[PDB]
C-alpha cells in the first residue's frame, strides 16, 4: 500500500507527480533508467510528489547545481526525505550551513585533501590486487559480493584504523541510513533514528580513545584538528566520525556496481581503456558523470519563487544527482560513456560548500580498481540472462552482478 500525503495549498495540481524515491517506477530496469523516466522533454523543473511525506523534486541539472550552490536559500538543516528521517539525521558537517560548517569541513580536509589521498595510492592498489587475484584465474565472480562490497570497505577501514571484522555491522547501519526500512514517513524516521544511534554507539569509544592520540589513522588526524581554538566538542565529534564512516562505506561500493554492469555490456569501451591507459585515467570523471548514486535534499529557507515555482519556507526539495549528469540538456547522448567527452559536468559529488570531501579518494579508488582489474581480467561480460537487482533511496544500491571471462 502506498502512503500519500495531501498537497499543501501552494502546490498546484499541474505540478503533482507520483514519484517514489524509495521504490522508483521502472527500477527493475535500472536506477539510472528509472530516474530518467521522470525527466521527460516537457516535465516541469520542479514537481511535487505525495509520497515519502510529500516533497519537491528538481528534474533538471541546472536547478540541482544551483540549489547545491545556494545554502543561504536552500539549507542543509534537512537533507533527507522523509522529513522525519531528515530531522533525526545527526551527521557533521552535513547538517550544518556556513559559517558553522566551515571549521568542520576544514578539519575533514586536513585528512582527505588531494595531497593526503595521493599518499594512499599504493595501499589501495595492494588491496585491489589481493582481492582480484583471488578470482582472476577462475573465469567468473559475483562482482558485488566478491569485489565491490569488499574493496572500498577494506580500503576505508584500514585508512580509519578499524578492524575489518566490523564491516558487516557498519554496512547494516549504512543501509538503514541511506535506504531506511518502512512504508510510512514515521516508520522511516524511526529506522534512520535507530541507525544513527547505532553509529554513535560505535564511534563513541573510538573518539574517547583517540582524543589526543598518537595514531596516524584518519580518525585521529581529523578528530584532533582544533575548532575555534579548542578541542572539537563531543556532540560534534560523534556526528563527524560517524559521517566519515557512512561516506566512506556506501557510495563507492554502489558506484562500482553500476559502473561495472555498464562496462560488462560495453566491451568496446573496456577495450579503449585497455589500449589507451591515459584514456582510462582521464576518463574516470566521465564515469562519475554517468553513475551518480546520491539523491538527497535541501530545506527552503524562505517563501520564494524559484524557476517559476512558488515554494514555501520549510518545503523540502529532493536533488536526484543522476538528473544532472544524465540531463540531455547538459550532455548529448547522456547514457553513453564517452571517455573523450570534453564537458563532463555533473553533481555526482554535489556542489557548493558541501561538495564531496571524499572526492579525491573516490576518484583514486576507481582509477586504481580499473587499472588493476584490466591488468588481470582484460575482457569480461555479464552472465547470459543475469538480472541485477536494484534499490533506490538516498543512496542507490545494486546487487547480483555475475561476471564471466576467459582467464588470460
Ligand atoms: C562514489 C563515491 C561518492 C559519492 C557519489 C559521494 C557523494 C557525495 C555527495 C553528493 C555529498 C554532498 C552531500 C550533501 O551535502 O548533500 C558528499 C559529501 C561528503 N562526502 Fe562523499 N561521496 C562519495 C565518496 C565519499 C568517500 C569515499 C568519502 C570518505 C570519507 C566521502 C566523504 C564525504 C564527506 C565527509 C561529505 C560531507 C562534506 C561536507 O558536508 O562539507 N564521500 N558526498
Ligand atoms: C549523501 C552522502 C553520500 C554524503 C556522504 C555520505 C552520505 C550518505 C551522507 O550522509 C552525506
UniProtKB/TrEMBL annotation:
Superkingdom field: Bacteria
Entry-linked InterPro entries: Cyt_P450, Cyt_P450_B, Cyt_P450_sf
Pfam families per the UniProt record, alphabetical: p450
UniProt keyword list: Heme, Iron, Membrane, Metal-binding, Transmembrane, Transmembrane helix
Similarity comment: Belongs to the cytochrome P450 family.
Protein name: Cytochrome P450
Membrane spanning stretches: 237-263
Species of provenance: Novosphingobium aromaticivorans (strain ATCC 700278 / DSM 12444 / CCUG 56034 / CIP 105152 / NBRC 16084 / F199)
MF annotations from Gene Ontology: heme binding; iron ion binding; monooxygenase activity; oxidoreductase activity, acting on paired donors, with incorporation or reduction of molecular oxygen
Binding site for heme b: 101, 105, 298, 354, 356
